[model samples]
Target chain A: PHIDIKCFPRELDEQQKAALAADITDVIIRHLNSKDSSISIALQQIQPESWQAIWDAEIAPQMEALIKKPGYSMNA
Target chain B: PHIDIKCFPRELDEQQKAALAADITDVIIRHLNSKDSSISIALQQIQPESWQAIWDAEIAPQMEALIKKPGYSMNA
Candidate 1:
């Protein structure tokens, strides 16, 4: 699984960014036992920091998850 | 289909959080062709230990991806 988190506009306050992160986190945990069998996950956070990091995190694990889950396919 | 991964320093150990990331990513791919086409994804990792990081990582890609995938509407 690949996970990436990031902030933007280059001027947002730290508190605001933190709040955003929290909200997003909530969403992830919500899917803990999602009924779907072909999916699995990974995490990463990218702001003004690292773009490739996000891709790498998600892609690497996606490769693994695909093999592990079987029949992994991106929605067109 | 915006996907996000995060952790809260307020609680959850590194391993627990790492586990959380993996869980979230799995859900995203699981729903690649979800029933309601009004979805997309953005992965994020947030540890309450770092407030701002969570914010930046989660929000940026969500916004950009929303623009990329049409039928943009957050489910209430």
Candidate 2:
């Protein structure tokens, strides 16, 4: 299991980032069943205004695959 | 920037995976900002029932950080 997280800017020193990463990794293993070595986390940053493109590329293309669809929309 | 995506099993041949990876990377660079070498894609497989844990760990703790919040809830 691999986890990719795209979010806007958030404050996280190295420690916080590592802490969150560890928690996420463990969450995947404990609940979702994946090897720690096999799992990785990618915390990609996107600007607020740039979210529309992300929705189009990532969400629109695979909405059926996304269990948790967005409550927010970028449509004007 | 990093993106951690958690979804249930979705079949993808190596070619499809590679193609989606490239598109996502390009999308990130075009709308967001990240070097190609700096970007990566992690398409995690989560069990449907196991999503509650992901919600708690990935979303509940950081709802403020999630650009697009989930429309579905794990709440009973």
Candidate 3:
């Protein structure tokens, strides 16, 4: 299975990126009880300025319709 | 509709990256005739050393089972 994570977190260091990958993988394995090697995780890092565009186009409508709201914000 | 592309090409400059994005967007538009602004694309750049790991672990078995073999290679 594949997990694609989209976020606009502050720029992270190399170690942070690696840690994020490892932690995410671990979570997937533990939650699904699946093989670690069977999971693929990819991070989509959005630039802060571009967030509003993505928000207006994809994010806002989804949240309004009750799909889900993200934990982070671009306007704040 | 969303199109997710995965590849492990050599390092690219900024202009090249932009060109790639544009080209991919154009192709998606032409093929699906979808709205330009509605599409979202993310590029995952895998380093040469890391390609083998991704290939050997995730790709090789999948290909052997007749899913699909990618055109690119890490060994070559």
Candidate 4:
């Protein structure tokens, strides 16, 4: 469930971009994730929030229901 | 809000689909918020962020209360 969010400086060179990507991936795979692999952090590029909104509407209702269930939680 | 992020390669089977959905929903339900329900997380998909300008506009008004309340400790 990783995503690559675009960086602010669009003109970052290849080496810089590679370094940034490696650093981010490292943060997620190493310091962020526990041995269980239950959760992880990621950065990804999205076209825009507006596009995401459409995606959210489809599954949000079900997810909300599951989230509200007495035995459910997001942090695991 | 909950959102379902689509996985690529578009031809996953129903068992795989169910497993995938269950895994995603389980994430939203098993940890993340307290019982007050004032805060809850439903991670189905799609996402975004707010800009600093918007952050300042939204939060600046209420922050004045921080300094005005005389009895409050730590008035920096």
Q: Could you report the DockQ of all the candidates, in the order they appear?
A: 0.07, 0.09, 0.03, 0.04
Model 3 over residues B18-76: C-alpha lDDT tens digits? Answer: 55556545544443444666555544445645657666665555554322234454454
Please report the candidate that would top lDDT against the real structure. Answer: 2
* Descending-DockQ candidate ranking: 2, 1, 4, 3
Report lDDT (Cα) of residue A37, candidate 2. 59
Each model's lDDT? 0.36, 0.58, 0.49, 0.31
Q: What fraction of the correct interface contacts does each predicted structure contain?
A: 0.05, 0.14, 0.00, 0.05
Per-candidate chain B TM: 0.33, 0.86, 0.57, 0.36
The candidates, ranked best first by TM-score, are: 2, 3, 1, 4
Tell me the tens digit of each residue's lDDT in model 2 across A32-55: 455665444556567878877887
* Stretch of 10 with least lDDT, candidate 4 chain B: B65-74
3 against 4, candidate with superior TM-score: 3
Scoring only the A-chain of each prediction against the true A-chain gives TM-scores of 0.35, 0.85, 0.62, 0.36
- Candidate 2: tens digits of C-alpha lDDT, residues B43-63: 667776787788777766655
lDDT of 4: 0.31
Which docking band does candidate 4 fall into? incorrect
Evaluate candidate 4 by giving its C-alpha RMSD to the native, one decimal. Answer: 17.7
TM-score of 2: 0.51
Model 1, runs deviating above 4 Å: A1-57, A61-76, B1-4, B9-30, B34-45, B60-76
TM-score of each: 0.28, 0.51, 0.39, 0.26
The runs of at least 3 residues in candidate 3 whose Cα sits more than 4 Å from the true structure, single-residue gaps closed, are A64-68, A71-76, B1-76
